[PDB]
Every structure is written in C-alpha cells, then in structure tokens.
Design a protein around this ligand. Structure first.
Ligand SMILES: [K+]
Ligand SMILES: [K+]
Lengths: 355, 355, 355, 355
C-alpha cells in the first residue's frame, strides 16, 4: 500500500521467452495437425535456443567483475539450456525430442529472486514439516486402513485392497473430493466426519507453517535490503540506536523508471518518500529537481492536504516510501527532527515556486 | 467487538438497484416463458436506466464543492451507465442487448469504499504475487507434463495431450477435485501425494499474502481515518507523543443515526465511548445530553457494574468506542488523567440525576 | 499449553440432551421400520420434553438473585422448548410433527458461552464482510456470465441459462468441485485459471477476516475475565501500572474439580500456578494445604527440575497458570519481587516437609 | 532461514523401519499374487519384529540413568510392539493376522518429539474446539435438515431421509464436493450459497485455532529449550534482565555433525553463530579452532562482506545462530558490548591468519 514498484520487475528477456516457448509444444501433441505450423514453431525453439545461445557466450564472458562470485546457480541451467535440446535432437529421432522442454522451466527460476528466499527458510522449519509429514502418513494409514476392514466384501473392485483406499484417503483428507469411488454403508461414512476435520486442521497447521516464518523472512527482506540507503541520508547521523529497528519494518525501497509519474498533483496526500539516488521532475514554475538524498510529502502530511506538485520520475530513481503514522511516529519520536521538517514545511512553500 | 456501526452503511440507492436489476435478466434467458413478465421487467431496466439517468444530471452538476477533485473514478461508470444500454438497444436488435447488463456491475464498485482499499496494497506486494504466479506455472507444467508421459497410451481421449493434463493439474492442485478424468495406473497416482501437499502450501503462502498486509492496511484504516477526531477532544493537549500510537490501533470511529440505542440500561458494562459530534439521550431524570466532545462509561468500568443510563442516539452522532483494558491502559499510563476521570466518576453520580 | 481445564466444561444436562434427542428423529424417517423402536424413542422426546419442562418451572422461579438481569436470551428458548412440540402434537396429526426438532437446536446455544463471543465481533467488522460479500457477487456474476456466452449452443441442457452457470461459479469458486456439469471447449476452460486463483484469494481474505479480530476478542477474553483474581493476591499492591498489561495476555484462569490431579511428582517441571480460591493436596509428610491466594512451581522453575510434590485438587479450585518465560519475565522485571520468591524457594524447601 | 539443522534429525532406526515395514502389507492384500514375494516380506516383519525385539531387551535394561523417570509413554508401545503380532500369529490362523500392522504406527510416535508438543496445547484451547465442534453440528443439522423438506418427494433414493442429507452437508460444508448426489430444484440450490460461505468461515476460525496458539508453543519452543546455552557464554553476565526476552525469540539451537560444512568462504555473509559445545574447522593458515563457547560472523556483518573463512564442522557441535538485525539490535542495544566485538572485528583479522 506504500510503494511505487515500476521499471519492469519482470525485466530480463532470459525469463520472458520460456512462456511463449513452452506454448510451442502443444501443437505437436495433437493429431490431425497440418505440417505448416507444426514446424513453424519448431523454428521458434531454434530461436530461443539460438537466443539464449546468443546470450550464452556473453554470459560465459565471466571476466566481468571477476573477483569473488558464486555462479554455479546462475550458470547451471545455461549449460543444459542448449545441450539437452542438442542431444535430444539426434538420439531421439522421433518428434518426442521436444518433450525435453522440461529444461527451460528452470530459466525463470534462474534469475528468480524471491526463489532463494523460498528455499532459505525450508532449512530451518522442515523439522516441523517432517514431524507433520510423518504424522500425515500416520493419520493416513491409521485411517486409510479402516475402510479395508469393511467394503472389501461388496467393493472388491474399488476397496479390495489397501492402497486403493490410501488413494481415497488423501482425496478424502486433502480437501478434494474427486468422486470416483465412495462407500455405501453407514460406519465407513461415519468416519469421514473426522477426516475433513483432520486434514483441514492438519493443513490448518502444515500450510500455516509456510507463511508463518516465511512472512518473517519477507518482513525481514524489508530490512536486510534496507539497512542500506541509510547512511546516504545526510540527516541520519542523529537517529537513536533503537530508533531504526522501529522504522525499517515499514520502509520499502523500489525503483521508478525515467519518464514515469511519482505523485500527481491534486490527489489526496497520503505518503512521503525518501530519495537517495537519481533525479525527479517536481512540477513547479522553477522545478525543484532534488537529486540523490532527498524527500517530499511533509508539506501535505503535516497539513493533511492534496499534493503540492506533480512529481514525475525524471530519471531511474531508487526510491523509498513512507506513510504518515510512521512519520507521525518519527515526529512523535524526537522534537529534534520535527524542527527541520517544520522549517522544510516552510522552506519548500517558497522554494517550490522560487529556486 | 467494540463498535456501534449503524446508519445504513449500505446507504446509497445508486448501489442498491444493481441487485434487483441484474435479477431482471434471467427470465429472458429461459425458453417457454410468457411475454407478460418478460417485458414487465424490461421496463425495470428502463427504471434504473431512467433512475441513474435521473440521478445522472444531478451528478453532472459538478459545481458542488468544485475547487480540486478527482472524479474520473466516480464518473467513469455513470457515463457508460446509460450509453451502453442505449447503443445496445439499437445495434443489437435481438433481445441479447440485455446481455450488456455486465455494465451496472461497477456501480456497486462506484461508491465502494473498501475497494480502493483493495487495489491500494496490490501495488506493493504483487512483486511476490508474480514470483509466486510464475512459480505456480512452474509447478504447473513441471507436474502437468509428468502425466502425458504415461496415460497417452491408454487414455488418448483424456490424456492424449498436454493442456488436457494442465487442466487436471490445477483442478488437482487448486483444492478442487472435479472428477471427470483421473488416472488408472500406480505411478501417476503416486504423484498426487505431492500435489495437494504443494497447492495447499502454495496457497498456503499465496492467499496468505493477501490478508498479510491487507490487515496492515485495514489496521491502518483505523488510524488514518482517526488521527482525526483527536484535537476536537478538549482534554488531549497533554497526551504524550508516543501515547497516541499505542491507542489509536484499537479506537474505531463509526456513526449512529438519530433515534437509535447506544447503551441500554442494566446490560453488563463492557465499553466506553468518546463523543465528538452530535447529541445523545442519556436516560436520567434530568437528561444529561452531552454534545460534541464528550464520553461515558467510566462510571461502569472503574466499578465493573451494569449501565447507569439508557443512552440513546438523539441525533446522528459520529462516535468513537473503547473497552476497559485500553482505558485501563490509559489509567495505567498516566496518573494525571485518572484524577479527572475519578472526579468524573463522582461528578456524573450526582450530575446524572441533577443537572 | 499452560492451563488445566477440568470440571466438565460441557456441564449442564440442559445442553447434553439435545444430542441424544435429535438422534431420536431419524428412525422415524425410514420406511420398513418396525413400530417397536419407532415410538420407544417417541417417548424419549417426552422425556426431554418433560425433563426441560421439569427444569422449566424451576427456571421460571426467577426470584433467585432477582435484582437486575437480562434473561431474554436464556429464557427465549425455554418458552418455545415445550410449546412448539405441544402445538406440533395436534395440528400436525401426521408423524411430521417430529420435524419440529429444529427447536432444541438452540438449547445448546442457550447456555453456550463462547457464542455471544461470536456475535460480538460481527458487529464491528461486517463492514468488511458486506464489502467483500458484494464483491463476492461482483466476481460471481462477472465470471458466471462469461460461460453463458459460449456453451449455450452445445450445452443448452446444462448452460442454457445464467443461474445454471451461477451454480457452477460458486462451486468453481468456493473450492468445491462437485463435478456434474463442466465445459468442453478451450476458452471456457481458460477462465477457470483465475477462478480458484480468485476464490482462494477472496476467502484468502474473507475467512481471514473472522479469525483476525476474533483472536483479538479471544486474546481479550483472557483479560476481561482476568483483571479479576488480581487484587485477591496479597502481593500485587506493588505491581507497576504498565506491568499487568504485559502479563495478563498469557495468564488464563480455569477451575479444577475436587479429587483431581494438579501436578504429579517427578514429571518435568514446566509451569507454576497462582491459587486464589479453594484448597489443594500438596503431597508431603506434612501436607502444605494452601488455601485461597497462593502459588507453587518456583521451586522447580528457578532450579529447572522435576516436581517437588504431587499436588492434587483437594477441592474445586479456581486456578490460574503460568510458564517460566513469563515468570522469568517477572523475575527479570523487578528485583523487588524475586527477593520473596527466592525466600519462598527456601521456605518451601523446609516448610514442605515441616509445617 | 537462520539455522543449520543437520545430523539426521530423523535419526533412530526405531523410527525408520515402520515405513518399509508397513509397505510389506499390501502385496498380501492382492489376489493373483505368487507365493514367492508373498512370504519373502512376511519374513521382513519377523526382521523388524526381531529387530525391535533385539532392541527391546536393551530398552528393558532400564538401569541406565535410573533415578527419576516417566517412561510409560516410551515403553507403552515396545510392550505391544512384539506381543500383538505374536498373539496375532496364532489366534488369527488366516493371513489376516497381518492386519495388526496398525500397531507399529505408534513407533514413529514413540520417539516423536514435536508430538507431545501437539497434545500439549489441545488441553488449553479445546474449550474453543468443543464450542465450535458443537456449533459445527448446530450448523450441520440446522442446514442438513433443510433439504429433507424438499427432495424427499423426487429423491427418495438419495434424499429420502435425514442422515442421507447430513452426509451431503459436511461434504457440502467441508470444502469437498464429492459429487454423487446433488439437488435438482431451485430453492435447495439457493441454500448452498451460505454453506461454503459458512464452512470456509467456520474452518476460517476452527483450523485457525490450531496454528494460533500452536505457533505460540513453537515460538515458545525456541525459548524453553534455549534459556539453556545462556550461562555457558562467558560474556552474558552483563546482559540486562529485559534484554534476553527480546533476543531469544529469534535464536534457535541446532546441532551440526562432524565433517559437515558450516559457512563456506566467499558466500554472501548473512548470519553469525554462537558456539557453546564442540569444535570447528576455521579454514585459515593457522586454523583458529574455537571450542565450546565462541562465535563468528561479526567480521562480515559489521562490514557487510562475504565470508572470511570456510568454517566446517570438525566435530558434532551444538550450535546457535543469528542474523544481523537482531545483532544490530544488540549493537544498538548497548555500547558496552560493541566495544569487544569491535575489538574482535580487529583481533580476528590478524588472529585468523596468525595463532
Ligand atoms: K474440493
Ligand atoms: K467431485
């Protein structure tokens, strides 16, 4: 609710082309298809093949910033990105070579920031997952077995064995209800009362495990990335030790691209920003283009008024952002700093129009 | 648990008539229907057409408070509210013109406060959504493909292709279990063990993303709306800087209409209110009708007793509300303020009966 | 994890008999049933009828504590508890009179504490529910309509109309997958990708609304009930103002019945209790039976050792309970109090064996 | 995200063999099976039978640490682990004796730490569960009955009775959608709009109850286990009373085995550890092998740089772990301690290479 995410977060074309490329598959997977578009898209693999391959050697030029780096992750796919299709071309003479389009599926995951964020936490809490995962199977066969006791007589063809019922168990447990094979008697139908009760409580916990400390990491992502952009601010030599931890939870940093809008004039003022790198377009008679290490919004927040200028992204600005309460928190936190922002709330009244 | 929401929050008839109006459709959508009610409700569109159209020009009289405003949202539908039916009337000579009742569906969303509250946060966290949304498709085709490996032999008609299985994937993943086409062999049935495990963990996170910071905004909605109604209180010149942030999290403001009940006598006392605008009906021999900027409940909360008066909404009062703990928090926070509320806990003992 | 809930929380037989009573119904609901047990359980209604009716007049003796009370809730069912069966007996001459066993279903809800706890919060946040509830219908017909566009041609019998598709919508949206009627074409199957994505995000929020502030009330239930049992403690004249709010979040009060066990000797010490009313059985050579207003566990918690005595519930004791951390929090909070609990950690070493 | 869990948390073979053992069952459960593997795995039961039985007497040698212990839980299964198969061998002459493989299912739960963690909390909050559990049945039959009103006429074979509809209720309520028997008329289809609305709100709460305070226990598990490993640190005589509670929430302790990696050189520095028992392999020219009661990472965290040494687990080290923010919190908390870690950030610059 408090950030301007822009400049094509889904940026690199190395990520983009997996999407159209994998859609190239399915037309091959269909009988009664004409040969025209059949191979027309077979070329398109050669495009992305050639394309990453065009990118590839530029990547293998790893003399860029070659001091200390760990690029086994980023490189691990680029290698097989072009090898597996190639060997797939020959040894699999039949068209099924295309079935090695399971390969590009990591290329999104190659430069997927937020995916290492995933795997980071699983190596702290999977202790729980396993204890639940076993317990999932505990309750699985504890319950899956109870049906073999019964309907083997009159449902051999469906419940004539154990894993036939283990199948129904997870489908009965995992919120699903396929609806191919269901009991007929009373007592087996009694038991389902506890099952959904169970699995919705189990995944009541288990899926809860994920977002539980995941959110900590994501709420932590807003700090580890953002104890940076702190000393750049010429004002933050005086902030107390315990002051920052209180604040940086809410502060997020994102970038705007050149030419974009930042805050349009007249809209209801509801946030202020901290600039640390780039330049803006403060729409005034004398445009007050503040460069790295600035801020704006106090004019509207102390007043509770609409915007005083159509600030637009003159350049690619690495931004921060902030709403009132947390700035009211700051204004409440120290009278030492509200002095200058009071002055700034008067300086920028004349300095917006003047130089 | 701590608020009196009244005075028709679902107030404007501009919102109301979409509901009965869209129910006008379906009778047209049915064969063997008599022409009587067929067109009788076709009039009802002309009503709401004429009705908003009656409202319309009053809205187009936007000389009301015409200083600085941003009404592209509110106006954007009112325009098409009457145009699309009109052009639909002619060019679509067949009755299908009624199928442009997809149009009024924004009219609720026109004056839907709490909907801009929705779209506000999606422009901060959709960074996550996309990284998950891709990852959803990662795990989709990563898994959806695994079945084409197998049942193409004996299920051409069901699993003779890829998207036929991508269909089963999300239905298998998204908690659903339609139950049209399911495997027959072992290994494909092995794989589903990880799928519900996955999708319930995925949406274990993904849907968790929404309420996660949504609640922050909603918990923030109780402040941005409510740093107002603060200076109006003649007592709050002394409240410390850090004091307010602690408090306003719990305080919500709502309005009661005239004639309604506020707190009935004899009921178990469990909350106190802050009045800031309007008037009440304090049921005493001399009704102590306190106007803008007052409060009541301390008589019962310090004592832990039932109500001392049937306070009823004499007028449309913009209210606040508060339970003990957070007032006990206040009584615990400063002895300076408990002095006067101690006195008030004696003044209103005589002043309730007297003038 | 920190409480001894005992003494039959599901206590009153006024609640108990709805369960066996409503099971009396179904045998009537079955053809080819013998008349023996048919009416044998028809008597059992007359039992519970007579039983509550036996209880009834004792309840109508409301001269007990008749000072100021609000018993429209508790009485509202007792009235109809016996009237509706009675009038049902005559005017419904056929056996269907039994179908007015929808009546007792409130009798559990009569003395269901934790149910007013439910309805309390819905009158603060249903503002959200409605805005979502409309939005549910927004997304309902926004999406439900999209299918009538398509399969009316080849699925008249299933998708020949709108509400026929509104049916499929919520079943498609609400996590269900019945599996009676599903599309055949591509584009309609494209759309479901957003639906489960939607409804799991919608109820990603909407059901989240409930537990969100519900938990606040339940976490608040541990205070409003428990600012009581505070002044009874002869030690708590010195606790700071801000000290209590920190503590009472964790403290829960429950009751143990006479004869029960409280803490068995030798088990790993992990909690301490505060007694405020009743008496115990501290298993020592001289049983140190401490009455109202006492505590125990510090002997094991400061030491981190097993139990020093088999404390058993000599009487019906209204208890409290506490784990270390929050007592370590207290020991960390003030050196003034750890003095006496240090002494108590030596007094009860000799005083447990001696008198 | 902040811990190195290693050394085979799923360690004891007493837990391991339930998994392969119970898979021994199903081949017996299948007709047209050859006798070869039929009994070949019947031996494998005799293995695990003999195996635990081999383990058994060693366990019955409970003279190890025989001072004060509570091993009714751990022993309770070991007894029946070998008895039930044995009596099952004889009295059940037919092969169905194998159906007493419901017995080993507790052996995982025998030494399942994190399972007593489960049952601990259910004895504090099941107050809620019951009030909801009744309420589940309230809403069950309140709604399940509504259908018998209607389709008994034209669906005797499906809705000719009450529990036939109670079946459809939970399946309709519990997110499932089996899809065997569904209404045909309008009004019964109207009602489902509230059902999924209900059950997703009900389990919106009910399953929420579990993770709610479960997480408290699990978040508490990181303290009760970890007020230990505190006094061992020779530096923590000066930490303030309120300081520790702030910290130990994040700190988790786990063990690494000998030979493993701890932090590899060159990787991005993102955490620091506290050693309290064992020894390491700090990869330097003079390996600075610090034994019980040490730490490392400050060199990278104050600098924000990659790793300064390939620390590898020389021995089985009981570890702690910590990220910056919470150490920045510590560096922010007291200047008294940053002095020595400043010095340590210079001592280990020379002392890493030197001795
Ligand atoms: K389902
Ligand atoms: K189904």
């Amino acid at each position: 609710m408090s950030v301007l995410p822009f400049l094509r977060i889904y940026a690199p074309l190395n990520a983009v082309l997996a999407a159209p490329g994998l859609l190239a598959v399915a037309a091959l997977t269909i009988p009664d298809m004409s040969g025209r578009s059949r191979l027309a898209l077979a070329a398109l693999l050669a495009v992305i093949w050639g394309a990453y391959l065009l990118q590839l050697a530029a990547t293998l030029l790893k003399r860029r910033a070659g001091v200390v780096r760990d690029r086994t992750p980023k490189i691990a796919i680029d290698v097989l990105a072009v090898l597996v299709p190639l060997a797939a071309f020959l040894l699999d003479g039949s068209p099924d070579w295309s079935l090695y389009c399971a390969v590009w599926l990591l290329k999104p995951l190659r430069d997927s920031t937020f995916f290492p964020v995933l795997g980071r936490v699983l190596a702290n809490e999977a202790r729980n997952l396993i204890g639940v995962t076993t317990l999932f199977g505990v309750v699985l066969f504890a319950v899956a077995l109870a049906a073999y006791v019964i309907e083997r007589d009159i449902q051999p063809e469906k419940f004539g064995s154990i894993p036939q019922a283990m199948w129904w168990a997870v489908v009965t447990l995992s919120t699903t209800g396929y609806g191919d094979t269901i009991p007929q008697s009373f007592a087996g139908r009694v038991l389902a009362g506890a099952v959904m009760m169970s699995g919705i409580g189990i995944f009541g916990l288990w899926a809860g495990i994920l977002a539980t400390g995941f959110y900590q990491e994501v709420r932590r992502g807003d700090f580890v990335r953002n104890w940076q952009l702190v000393a750049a601010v010429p004002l933050f030599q005086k902030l107390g030790p315990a002051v920052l931890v209180e604040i940086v939870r809410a502060l997020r940093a994102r970038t705007v691209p050149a030419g974009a809008v930042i805050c349009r004039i007249g809209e209801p003022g509801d946030r202020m920003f901290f600039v640390v790198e780039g330049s803006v377009s403060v729409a005034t008679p004398n445009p007050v283009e503040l460069g790295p290490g600035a801020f704006f919004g106090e004019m509207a927040l102390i007043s509770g008024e609409p915007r005083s200028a159509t600030v637009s992204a003159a350049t690619t600005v690495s931004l921060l952002s902030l709403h009132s309460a947390d700035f009211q928190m700051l204004c409440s936190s120290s009278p030492e700093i509200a002095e200058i922002f009071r002055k700034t709330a008067l300086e920028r009244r004349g300095a917006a129009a003047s130089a």
